Design an enzyme around this catalytic site. Structure first.
Site, short mmCIF file in Angstrom:
data_model
loop_
_atom_site.label_atom_id
_atom_site.label_comp_id
_atom_site.label_asym_id
_atom_site.label_seq_id
_atom_site.Cartn_x
_atom_site.Cartn_y
_atom_site.Cartn_z
N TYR A 161 22.19 -3.45 29.15
CA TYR A 161 23.63 -3.45 28.89
C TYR A 161 24.35 -2.51 29.86
O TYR A 161 24.20 -1.31 29.77
CB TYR A 161 23.91 -3.13 27.39
N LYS A 190 23.50 -7.80 29.65
CA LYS A 190 24.90 -7.95 29.23
C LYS A 190 25.69 -7.14 30.18
O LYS A 190 25.55 -5.95 30.19
CB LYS A 190 25.15 -7.40 27.80
#
Lengths: 292, 292, 292, 292
Positions: free
Chosen positions: C135, C163
């Site tokens: 992330y 992400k």
């Protein structure tokens, strides 16, 4: 009303051995661009070394590109500067040499307010019957033309388009939404061509179309066709190539790139310098990576 | 060899109701400034609206001010632009009307490299016998003149100083250290005059000096005499006044502030605009808090 | 190998009146999301208030959600902090309670180096049998995970996805190009869902899917088919709604939104605060603007 | 009421070969610091690797340090995290062990509002009878504690100072003006020590003081005495040494430097790493350039 198509090319300004405009070379380039995917030409912008051009040179160049183009494709003059009265003046000289529209940069260096920019642009637009294209370029002028300021200016009859080089497709989407459907929103960042059209942009005002206009026209067609894998492969070539072209101050990379494929357009005026050897070899490698 | 003192003023260019240079008012201003702390005058720079001045207007302004000043204080002409050859020509024209030095700004809009800026400044400096001041202003030009570029340029005999509007006194401190003793470093941010001089800056190139020059010279002298409590209170005032002069695009706030204290030097050229009534009210209040 | 779908949801954590986890309201939320377009659930992450959850709570929450999900959709636990050793420990507890993957944020606050992050992530990955989702959120952690650094990590067997909330689809494109085809790249910014998927992103890790999941599912189906009119119309709803959920720090807005449309999930823990009655009214009328 | 003096040192936490706290090296360091210019100690902050400390290690370290210092110098424990409840708890524990004060950083990662930070800091302050020092560090928490917020917080009786690592001595000047005389403002940026004190700051919360704290104390005295050119040579050394200390993620460089001057405090915990051989060579050469 007017239609600049999907790829407007931000055209270099070729120079001879002495650094004067080379008008025979300008004629090869204009013909090549048209044969290679260019649907509108922007004359004497940032990519044309507008800062080091004189007003007499700008008008000669506009007049000459108007003649050689010969209504094949709209001709947009970069008449806008950071001086409103100067901009009204050069705008009228471009109109009288028969260019089809004017491109008006967000004033650089003097950092105007939004209301100030609104009056700048309203005044230059008032000075001509011609179609106006706004040019937002925070990365050179610092200021943004706010979404609200753009929506206000679209309301004006001959303010028809914006080249948005803000790098932000969410800002573009807001300008599309809030402007009428006859207000054309163009990306001004090559590599954002695909995502911006994804969100509603009419096309790109391009620098990489000097060397891969066909591939770009290909990419756009393939994405409009729903052939995403095809588009994405071409998108990635565009991004690779665009990056090779801004490793040194533009337009030295793209003038050098054009030379490396047998279309010499001379060098550049100070404060720009030629590529170093190192820089040449690096761009060379990327130009070789382009499929044929 | 040349000495610009502690407070060089970035002088506005007075205009009439019709936006023409008002030379009588320029005289009133020059003499006011010299009576109120100004140890050197910068003519026709950013604050003097260099962007909306013609080449011919600039040279007439240089000439007027050389003549009014009458050697009481050195006169610095903002001849540098983002175009090198033109910066050379303006520089000769200014040499010829009797100025004492020239200031050269980091090229805006075209985004040159450090080697390109190095050749820019070198060339202009080799074209003139005048002393040369650099001008770092990333907040208007985007690019920084790097410390190492500044150092290389310092080694040119007639490149004698720099105005650093970079906002960073650590960068200034590095320039000071790495340059010889005879290279003078100025702050270009009024608010930082006090902390800049603590680290060894020679002084400030100032906009606030148009209205609180006497309080600035007094602030400097208290500091220099180790009257720290006094300097801090005056510094506090300078920061408050300076902030109020940049809530709208400069030089408009300061041209209004002069009218408020009796010296009416006009308004500003497009793309810049008069204060609103609301904007004037705010500025008024701040000027009414300057001690009598 | 694991498939998270086109719309993973960064799930809020329902609190009761005294600020403790509401396990019954959690059950209700999970069942709603799965019924409204969510293809994978991210539990106890930024949006579920990971900073204010105790490690015990986190694990109690991972367990319950797995239970209620009952294998209908992947469950991704948010087990990375800026402490590698503690991230390994919670990754372990998570695994034992039977989640399907873990999500690991770039370390916030301590500003590690590219190589440090590489060792952080490599060490956490090696501690567990589960699939790992990286992330990138420079907007909360400051450091970016650089393309090269993500590429090296993609070569690790259980590192399967990223992400990317860096807000830049040109960085995305480069991760897509330089990673193998089995590395899923998700937008982490709702408004970039469509341009991202345009350049090859696999989907979105969403906050707005809390209240407009079906509409987003429809927008993605439209786009993947080539119906760019209806895609662009829904893309414009997406962007507007997303924007209204981020006018106050998240996840306070979307919790409040959930209550307006009929699923109250309580308030937030300090240092977060309830929306002001005025912030409520503003959001409430964006919510009423959604076509029913 | 409580006086931390000119140089509070942000103290590293010595680790042994296994990464566990080394109490013998902690004791050596406290005594070295106190003999080499440290007028107060910050324990278990950023520079002490608070992120990779357990709650139990933190309080152990608070204890040890308290008993070693034996009232010789105030002890400030860094109990503030981005979780308000947790921060109240750690603060309550630090208080029971006998620290003199607590530091409270602006929440990192969860991006709280000015009013959320107001309530976060108020609640924590209300929870203890100890003095409280705020810590603004936007280069790690992204949010800023606004000047107005700091002024509201200073009205609270046990909120008596701030470490401002905001990089901006003009926001510091405003805080100093707007708060009462008994609210103390420190720089949190070593390089800025001299110019921050020029504008009225009490002194510095420091990392360089681990290796050149004697020279800093020398410099500060020189400035206060009006020996400005002597302070300026020491300032240059400060800035130069400080920069070598932040080339890799702090505190690995200052721990490396300590070992070089004969005080080994071990290495660091993941996600941070030892200097490379490269980085070590470069740091060494800066340490050799200090006058001994």
């Amino acid at each position: 009303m007017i239609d600049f198509g999907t790829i407007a090319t931000a055209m270099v300004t070729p120079f001879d051995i002495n650094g004067n405009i080379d008008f025979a070379k300008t004629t090869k380039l204009v013909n090549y661009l048209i044969d290679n995917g260019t649907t509108a030409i922007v004359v004497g912008g940032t990519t044309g070394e507008s800062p080091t051009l004189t007003s007499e040179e700008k008008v000669a160049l506009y007049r000459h590109v108007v003649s050689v183009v010969d209504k094949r494709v709209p001709v947009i003059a970069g008449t806008g500067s950071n001086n409103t009265h100067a901009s009204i003046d050069l705008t009228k000289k471009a109109t009288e040499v028969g260019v089809d529209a004017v491109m008006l940069v967000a004033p650089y260096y003097n950092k105007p307010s939004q209301e100030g920019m609104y009056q700048h642009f309203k005044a230059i637009a008032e000075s001509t019957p011609l179609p106006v294209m706004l040019y937002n370029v925070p990365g050179r002028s610092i200021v943004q033309i706010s979404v609200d300021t753009v929506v206000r200016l679209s309301e004006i009859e001959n303010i028809v388009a914006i080249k948005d080089a803000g790098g932000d497709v969410l800002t573009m989407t807001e300008i599309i939404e809030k402007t009428a459907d006859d207000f054309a929103v163009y990306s001004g960042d090559d590599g954002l061509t695909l995502p911006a059209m994804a969100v509603g942009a009419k096309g790109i005002v391009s620098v990489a179309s000097h060397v891969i206009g066909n591939e770009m026209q290909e990419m756009i067609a393939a994405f409009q066709a729903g052939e995403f894998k095809k588009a994405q492969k071409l998108h990635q070539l565009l991004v690779r190539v665009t990056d090779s072209l801004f490793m040194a101050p533009s337009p030295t990379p793209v003038k050098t790139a054009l030379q490396m494929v047998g279309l010499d357009v001379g060098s550049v005026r100070l404060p720009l310098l030629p590529l170093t050897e190192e820089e040449r070899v690096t761009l060379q490698s990327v130009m070789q990576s382009i499929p044929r």
